[model samples]
Target: MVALSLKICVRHCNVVKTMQFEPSTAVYDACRVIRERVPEAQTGQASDYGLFLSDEDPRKGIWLEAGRTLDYYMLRNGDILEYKKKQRPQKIRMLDGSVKTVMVDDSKTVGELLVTICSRIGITNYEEYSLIQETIEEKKEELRDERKMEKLKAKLHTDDDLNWLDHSRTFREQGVDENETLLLRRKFFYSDQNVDSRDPVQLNLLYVQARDDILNGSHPVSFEKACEFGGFQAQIQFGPHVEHKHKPGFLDLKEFLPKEYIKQRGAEKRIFQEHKNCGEMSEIEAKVKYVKLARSLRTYGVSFFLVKEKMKGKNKLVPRLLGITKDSVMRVDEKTKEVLQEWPLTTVKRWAASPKSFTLDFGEYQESYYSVQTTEGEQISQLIAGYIDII
Candidate 1:
């Protein structure tokens, strides 16, 4: 196989002044020679020829050497060449209903051109048309209509219409999104970190159970259940109830009793000192004072109490455990256990009844969230189910 020969040529040229052609040689011929010598050179056909060294040339050929060949390269008629800066093109609307191209060198924004077009066409107002290019006198009116429809749709589908008390009703009627319903129910209560006790979900379930009964004018068997679980005493109080209030010492004397009682019951006896006529008593021989004092009021009369306890280096509010009467017929297990019963259909008619407050505590371990699940696939389906199941 034979390899093709490659050639590299180097040429140098000098700048010359413009002049009329002296002989039969045309400006085109001079241009042709300059082009052959420096293929990258650009020549303007308007002025005298000059040397334009390429950027690839280090010195830019700013100073050319004067030589005899320079004259032949210099003077020529009809040879117009000069180094001039290139101009950017301008944009204009074309007559053919198409956009005319402009050079990037021009710094005009699309919005500016549109404004100019609107001005030239004598358009006083510009706005978006909603009816698929159909013109309307007032764009704002069209927007207002769109917004009104959106609001209507939102009201029709949203639970925001219901008050705090109506949440259960709203859920029942509209059949809320399962996750959203759960979240709404969860916010009603709080509990310890381990979720070891009462929670908002439990309270909510009870609330729904109670509310349905109230709204329907039916007595809640659950009410009797709640009262029974509370331990039916002659007088039930909401304060801490410990069976062994006096055995060792009560947890907090400041609560359920007066401050004077706490001070007296908690006082330490002083050592005895004797004057010449008085007898002396050792610290251990002082009067045997009872550490706990009895409450002035009857035990059954206590209704509410507040106490403070320290946890995590901060004092927090804790509800006092209330004692339920041992003889109460309603067992705690029967009242607190989860029940699968549904609200009776008649409850809907009792919507005007006063609602009760309930607490839901998710204990400590569980996230403070609550949710109700529904198998109905659609809002209408859920509504129809509720309607049909009504008593």
Candidate 2:
């Protein structure tokens, strides 16, 4: 048999590697060779890195199937393969439809925290849109930085001639062709009207970013919304639901929801009906529906902070989410967005803050208060007071 030629797009390698392999290659052989070349310098080891069929971009490649031969995947000639760390990094998005990738840890902050972001970088009516931190004073600061910061400018593959897969072919019969280029490009421009998008590339971009949002754990989603999204995704990838086969826990919430939202860690709740509800939708329709639903989230276009709150009642600080939506001040659960208390700007009659916490006096008495903690107390104060003045 002739040598099966391959091009390896080793991550961070930034060079083209042409390797020759036997047509008889299986995934075990494939991964061993991959780790062998990756080296101790890259900390390469079993289960440490993964193999994906390279497409136009490193981030969008498809995983090589387990126990499958190159022939099993219907490949017998030239192909592109790449190894990336088994641990995946996430992609975060802004209302403008652009995306960002940043390494996060205990050390991260908003200036470089979502901070390198405010310096670096949405809207409805009945709901007016405003930047999260922008206010009467921020408008003044905005005017100053506005001059210098005004500008900066900046898919998945499948083979079978159309440059898109037919969605009908499987590896058993379909063999991908080489020399065809893979590249990621923007699909939708903007506007509410554009949500009815049919472009596979656009949907793919949105799905990946949404998935990352779920994994990153900061976008506090309600349980209902999380399952609603899982349903749309289930229909997209698996086709119509099998009531018994597509059982509730069959699709792990970890893939579709932030870990904090799983209020009950050990119990398996049923999500079968959620999948059934989405039965009539096509993959395109599900994508479009998801786009509409995601934008409707309270945190959808807002920049957020993961916070620890020494709220009332506890000796130790409890993790919490302080939601200062354009019009409301809400105290939410640290991980899930379960609301503990909520107050509107109209009732937030007396409010005050310091570096350690924010206080809101609402309802009948000055003694009645809602307090939460964050160093951005002034920030909470500014946004709240800003809305009060505008109203």
Candidate 3:
């Protein structure tokens, strides 16, 4: 039988192991090999974890099925596999003002967190309850450096004070601090228009009423109030509101929709303003529009500039639209919209940023660099440098 060579990358474990397997090798066999080679995978107690195929495209990777063979799945040579452990329980404060630790898988969605919290509180109807995660800002001096500030900005929304948790992301990936506590409150349904009457009625109506009774005379349950509830006091307060803004890039929605659709969406502001003036919009509708706009902006591919030296060795800057998704970053031409060069984020060994430019050093023995120049080059350098450090 033919043998297939593969590489295994274990998360939280430093070692990468290579093994040869038959074409008929099942995912279970690959996992058994990992357990034997990686000491971290071996435990006296039962463990809850699984193997997942790592792909260059983030959307294409899937969990390895125990019953399927490598041949059956058509796994290529030198394929990367990741071994992930189940997320540990994090402590959180319940609505009743009691602290409890709950075991939640990091892969679970925000909707799942809502379901789990409701289940823990013995409520069957979960739709009426909303989960609000608390945000505690670190001192501005602590994040005075560019990299640190960029990371914080990436995880935050335009409203720096409160983060409206994206229901799409998992709890662990939301960048919440390990020590931070989450709050559960009755959702004030924005409008009856968006609320479906066919869904289950709020069976736990008394739950919300009781919560209101407890906080009737207390301070408003805001970020400040939540901080007080958690017994947290701000260490240092400094603000005149420094804003970090990036130049606008064209959204790469051409792949998803027609050119006309893109043009129409560009006029979204005028349409929204007209509706507002007519008093035909609801808060829920406004929120929905905002979310749609945000999502569209986020779904677009990379935006950066390439720095090159001309014949006289003088620096020349070329505007380019790079493709940056979960898996890789590619240098793309704005005219042809074709990828010029591509690099996996994992291959990035070291990176540094100067006031006017940032450089990425990749590979070992024979290192290569990709540099870019930006208007806010110092800030850009810090942002990418900090991001590379975490990756």
Candidate 4:
């Protein structure tokens, strides 16, 4: 009764057990063997598990049909067979607008997916980021002409719209499926080491994320702020202005300064001369410098949640924005984007959140609460909780 030997593995990319099978054995029968041999693959579900071909190239992977014999996949002695819960293709998008795919199964959580997903992106410091349930891209408008009643409507598409990935829970339990894409963005902004990583892969990876916000007007800059940061950008692009090596077309204001200053003939001259001030500086230093400068801006660390605030005595739920930050929660003016009020995170006794509303209670000390109406209340609660836990 000689048999063909095949290595059995779960999708953790680890060989759990090796087993013997007849050449004509059906893959379904092989999975039955895996349940008894690997034991770990034996979940409560009666028929959710299957044996799949260990696809050499991940892109063209295949699950062995149950009715097909092991011979169908050219299974020979010592070939590897995957035994686990069923897998569905899931797409994870990075901050730089690049997409990567992960094969998810019933038991796999958002926590387990990071190792493989981050590895593909050449990231070893994986825990520094999280997978967003969905994209937050939204149109932006500054406080210009005040409409009678309008939402803050500033750039909602910033990288700061991070909701926590419950690492201890299952993705299936969390309602993460193949239908929509997930975003991989940095989870915290409090650390500088996130950008100063040893991997150039992540160095540029994170810099691009920081760079996008500035370009998208997520961080509204003053003229001085634009020219100040634009100097860093220009230094990175053209290098320290060498007198004979560079000329007039060398600096393009449109590429560096904000739209308003691009036409200010003097702005270009100022930025061109500003880069010269960064004498002997290389692109790497300039980029890191640019990122640090952006990080120092007051608005950089805030997550803007669009919600309608309800005052205790007011009849209508007024349109306003919550500027959730590391230190405090600010009730922002929807029109001016100014901080109308601030509640220190330490004073936040507790918060109640529903699918429709979020209420922050500052009990005993302040003895009052701030309420907002939004479907994003749950996410806001989780994000603020995470931020509070850190402090």
Candidate 5:
């Protein structure tokens, strides 16, 4: 047997296995090696996974047969190969908010899946769309008992979390399971032509006005009042340029608006902006502006009052300046007025709320459950839950 060095890239496992193989080894033999080397690539049968040359395009890659030997196919030393798992049909929700069944292979990258889905949904401009995957874990305890599930459901009314794909990982690598509903969302942005000609000055004015409106009486007054009456100061200082760039907009404004009011405003803005002509402000533009402002706001922090429950035999509620952002939540010491402990949103497993109190479960820690009791606890819980849902 003539030895030949080869690199086998397993798409499903996102790993590369390099080893020596016989020059006359069959393609199926290489797959057997892959199954043994990469745990995620294992299947009942080796034929369930297909072997292809790495250099070829995945859509039109040259597949190696089970019976053919490597030398027979003119494979040379240092040849690169890819092993792909057989595609299975899975259900996914499209951008139009419709669910459809599509065949997806574990070997295909998320970018490829997005393109394929967009094409199926008749979206020509794929660049304007994004793929968001959310995993909702239904435990057996919830499934077995209806009353228990209802209580659990009432305790937690929000979705788990929204995850955005940023890397070129395959479906299996991303842990996409069968029958899971993958959500496709459109990327919020102004068209190139619109963004290029947009006036930053006018956008800034609209943002400030919207912020003032919310602070006044148009929306909830918790955040603004919390800043004023609660004696919570902004932990992050912003320069004039940064401040001017991201004055809060209507979407950026929150705290006092009831759920129904927020919903109505969202609907009104969506309708008003979608059909309006150019040179006039549109909802889409506002959304883009809000995103920019929110990003800036996350860096600069918002200070508000929150009740921290101290676990000293009997729990006691302690008032503190709670600093919040898109990234994390922090507890500020009342006396020192400095951040004591912080919890990143990424570490949050699940959270539940009552009328005047809420509990945060961080999965594992000495202080796993962080309780808060505040008059505005319900509103704050809803606000945090909403942020976790969309982000």
Candidate 6:
């Protein structure tokens, strides 16, 4: 991936400059540099590390024919070079009293500029003897006044006439600016990044879903269905917030949680009771049933596992379990606190409901579906059910 070192020179026995090589420079980069430094200097890369010389060697005054190819001489440290600044084209008043000029870089197209020049002189005989020259090449498809009239007439009378006429008149009256035209041309010639994805389709689906929701109609496809397509859960937590652990444990949240952690002060008491499942059943029933059942359990911790279907590389079902205690409300290891775990419910259920699904059956707590996937799925459904514990 080595690039050839190059030498640049001015015309005559004058100034010469040597260029240093940059690692892994490509032909494209070379072309870009030449364009920026010498806009009129056209050069090409050959197989033998030469930039093919186009036009007269800037050093020698010999003019090479248009398609002539020349080998690039390896630039030496002190070679002389020459550069000729491009002279601007001169405007000329024609015999018909019309002003004309070779099209400048920033000027309008040859045809458009000619029409303007013709109109100024009231030259209705534009098609009779049009302007021509090597540098001011005549555009083969230039529209004569008759053609322009016919085009306008066709636009007015065609079935889709109004639309065409509207756009034509609109464009002429409010022409696109240079920047807008350049952006549009760039967009018309777009290239793709090398990534395979359904993002565009997914975005379109989301847009359609939003439109459907605005009109109070069912979306053609549901995000829930999309989740199901990936064999993942679509269920969302019902509460505004849930008690998460700094370390896994059962502790009353009312007293100790940091004040900053309390989203709504009034709702704090309800959080503890909900965690203990206090009100739905009598305190006696709750203690004798859920709390005792939870504490006496051999396994009590937060854990997560995932089954990835298509991992282009090596994907594995990794299960992780964090230790829990009754000392604190929720104590998660600081390092693991910010970790995001995907507990695909459908995948969990497939393992949980297996006939070979081990000894400590979580079928007993099926009614606790809310707790099952969130705080309890991995521990209760997998580990508590006499499955292997993840470290």
Please tell me which predicted candidate would have the highest TM-score against the true structure: 2
RMSD, each candidate, Å? 36.2, 21.1, 25.9, 23.9, 21.0, 25.5
Model 6 lDDT, residue 235, Cα: 10
Assess each prediction's global lDDT (C-alpha) against the native: 0.26, 0.56, 0.50, 0.70, 0.56, 0.30
Candidate 3 displacement at residue 224 in angstroms:
51
Which tens-of-lDDT digit does each residue in 1-391 have in candidate 3?
Answer: 6678877776654657777878887777767777887786675421456666645654434555667877776866787666766555767766667767876655567776665555445443345666667655777975569978899878885754444576777654566545667776556555453322211133223223323322342111222222221111010011111123211232232322223333443333322223333232223222232222222332233434444312225565566653445546666654344566777778867766677666667785443456665445565555555556675
lDDT of 6 by residue, 269-351 (tens): 43343443322222222222222222222322233222212122555422323222222112122222333323322223333
Which regions of candidate 1 are displaced past 4 Å?
Answer: 1-23, 42-80, 83-90, 96-99, 102-391
For candidate 4, the TM-score is 0.37
Q: lDDT score of model 3?
A: 0.50
- How far does residue 242 in candidate 1 sit from its true spot (Å)? 99
TM-scores vs. true structure, each candidate: 0.12, 0.39, 0.32, 0.37, 0.27, 0.17
Q: Which stretches of candidate 4 lie over 4 Å from their true place?
A: 1-195, 198-202, 217-223, 241-273, 306-321, 325-328, 331-344, 352-359, 364-368, 371-379, 385-391
Using alpha carbons, what is the TM-score of model 3? Answer: 0.32
Worst 10 residues of 2 by lDDT: 122-131
Prediction 5 global C-alpha lDDT: 0.56
lDDT of 6 at 326: 26
- After superposing candidate 5, which stretches have Cα over 4 Å from the reference? 2-49, 52-85, 136-161, 188-391
* Clash counts for the predictions, in order: 26, 10, 0, 0, 2, 16
Best by lDDT: 4
What clash pairs does model 2 have?
A: 56-182, 56-183, 109-113, 110-113, 110-114, 110-115, 111-115, 111-116, 112-115, 112-116
For model 6, the superposed segments whose C-alpha errors exceed 4 Å read 9-15, 20-28, 31-53, 56-87, 90-103, 106-130, 134-391
Query: Higher-lDDT candidate among 2 and 4?
Result: 4
Residue 43 Cα positional deviation in candidate 3, in Å, after optimal superposition: 4.0
Tens-place lDDT per residue, model 1, 1-391, is: 3221211122232444333323434434444454455444444442223322222334222211112222344423343333222223433333233444332211123234333332222221211100011122566755599979999897889563322322222221232221221111112223332322122333334333433432232321233222221221101122223334322342332322222223443221110001111122111111100000011111221111111212344555322221112111011112222222222333322111112211212233333321112222243223333444552
Candidate 5: tens digits of C-alpha lDDT, residues 1-391: 6788877777643787777888878877777777877786775667467886644433344557778887777877788877766667877776556778877655567777665555444443445666677666688775579978998889989975557765487665565666777777766565553332123444445445445443443322333222321111111111111233433352222342323334333333332232231122233333333323332332233545546666567755666656556778877755444567888888878877787777778867656588777667767777777768887
